[PDB]
């Protein structure tokens, strides 16, 4: 019933590990379909070969800008941006997958994986999934980031797709 997608992560081309995500399509369906479809690449464009452009140790890893590769772009499968579906789920801990945005109703394709409890984000970013397998791969990724987000090595989504 709820889709599961994976990401095979790479640090400058060396394979690092697989993170897999359960998308809560039963509560945030339109948000979950957009991450699912961008992971499969079935609509022609997507995450494969994009990188995490902003990694802040102890906060979150952000990625998903496949058009401009630096947080200023990305687009959804419904157009460039769409509404905040709802705020049922909250940022309760590491592994929560939440939507990045540029204020309300500006969701595109950028997402962030929390590596800590970030309750201040509640009510401001739609949560739509959580890490299933691979959280120590997300944790190891932190080491390649910095206080301001700049990463030291290129961290890419080498491959991604749907598992179930």
């Amino acid at each position: 019933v709820n889709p599961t997608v994976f990401f095979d992560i790479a640090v400058d081309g060396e394979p690092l590990g697989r993170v897999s995500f359960e998308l809560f399509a039963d509560k945030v369906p339109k948000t979950a379909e957009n991450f699912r479809a961008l992971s499969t690449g079935e609509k022609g464009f997507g995450y494969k070969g994009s990188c995490f452009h902003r990694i802040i140790p102890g906060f979150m890893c952000q990625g998903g800008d496949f058009t401009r590769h630096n947080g200023t772009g990305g687009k959804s499968i419904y157009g460039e941006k769409f509404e905040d579906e709802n705020f049922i789920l909250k940022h309760t801990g590491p592994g929560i997958l939440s939507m990045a945005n540029a204020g309300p109703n500006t969701n595109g394709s950028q997402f962030f994986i929390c590596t800590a409890k970030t309750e201040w984000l509640d009510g401001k970013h739609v949560v739509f999934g959580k890490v299933k397998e691979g959280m120590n791969i997300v944790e190891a990724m932190e080491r390649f980031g910095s206080r301001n987000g700049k990463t030291s090595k290129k961290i890419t989504i080498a491959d991604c797709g749907q598992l179930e």
């Binding site: 906060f59 979150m60 952000q62 947080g71 939440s98 990045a100 945005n101 540029a102 204020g103 962030f112 970030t118 984000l121 401001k124 970013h125």
Partner: peptide, 4 residues
């Protein structure tokens, strides 16, 4: 840009 967000999350802040």
């Amino acid at each position: 840009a967000a999350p802040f």
